[PDB]
Ligand SMILES: Cc1cc(F)cc(C)c1-c1ccc(C(=O)O)s1
Ligand SMILES: [Cl-]
C-alpha cells in the first residue's frame with residue numbers, strides 16, 4: 566500500500582443565490598454547522614466549537630463557496646474555532662483580514678496555498694473596523710438574497726480593479742452575517758429565512774446586532790454557569806432596542822446554535 570494519498574484542500578460547502586429557497590438556505594446553514602462541530606461537545610443542548618489549543622491544522626478551517634446568478638464564485642475561509650470569516654479566494658487571488666494574533670497569523674499560511682496572489686488587509690475583520698471602511702453601520706446595510714448576490718459580485722471583482730474598499734467592506738459585512746452569524750444563532754438564521762421567504766431586503770434590527778456583539782460573552786456565561794445559571798446577567802436588546810437581562814441558559818437554547826470553546830466540558 567506503498568503510495569500515500571492526501572486530501573488537497575479543506576472541506577467545501579456550496580451555496581448559490583441562483584434558485585435560493587428557504588429550504589436551500591436551511592440545508593446550507595445546517596451543513597456549515599455540521600462541519601464546524603464534532604457533535605461530541607454539547608452543553609445545555611448547545612454545541613461547542615473545537616478548542617483551538619492543540620487543534621490539528623488540517624481541522625482548522627472550512628471553506629464556503631458562494632455563487633450567484635452570474636456564475637461568479639468566491640470561496641470564504643471560516644475558522645472552525647469561532648465560525649468567523651478569516652479571508653477569501655476569488656480566482657487566482659486570496660485576501661486575508663489582518664490576524665488578531667500571531668497564532669492566527671500562522672494558521673492562515675495554510676489556507677489557499679495554491680493561489681498565485683496572496684494579500685493581507687491592514688485591518689481586521691471585526692464589525693467596528695469594517696463599518697468604518699464601509700462608511701455605514703450594520704444597522705444601515707440591507708441583508709437578504711439580493712444583498713448577498715451583490716456582495717458575491719463585489720468580492721469577486723475586487724481583484725480586477727472594479728470593486729473599491731468601501732463596497733468590499735460592506736460586502737464582507739453582508740457575507741459574515743448571512744453565513745457566520747446565521748451559523749452561530751438560530752435566531753439570526755431565522756431572520757435570514759424570513760427575508761428569503763418573502764423576498765425582502767432589510768437591515769438587521771438591534772436584537773440581531775446585540776446578539777452578534779454578545780456571542781463571545783454568551784459563550785463564556787454559559788460554559789462558566791452553575792447548572793446553566795449565570796452569576797451575572799447578560800444584557801441583550803429587543804427588536805426596538807430596549808434592553809433586557811438573561812439570567813440562565815434556558816431562554817438561549819432556541820437562540821444560539823454554536824459557542825466558542827471556553828473551558829473543558831464537565
Ligand atoms: C426571547 C429572547 C431571548 C434571548 F436570549 C435573546 C433574544 C434576542 C430574545 C428575543 C426574541 C425576540 C425579541 C423581540 O421580539 O424583541 S427578543
Ligand atoms: Cl440544560
Ligand SMILES: [Cl-]
Pocket residue numbers: 667668670671
Ligand atoms: Cl505568526
Ligand SMILES: [Cl-]
Pocket residue numbers: 727728729730732733
Ligand atoms: Cl466599488
Ligand SMILES: [Cl-]
Pocket residue numbers: 828829830
Ligand atoms: Cl474545565
Ligand code: NI
Pocket residue numbers: 663
Ligand atoms: Ni500587522
Ligand code: NI
Pocket residue numbers: 702
Ligand atoms: Ni455598532
Ligand code: NI
Pocket residue numbers: 788789827828829
Ligand atoms: Ni470553566
Ligand code: NI
Pocket residue numbers: 828829830831
Ligand atoms: Ni470546563
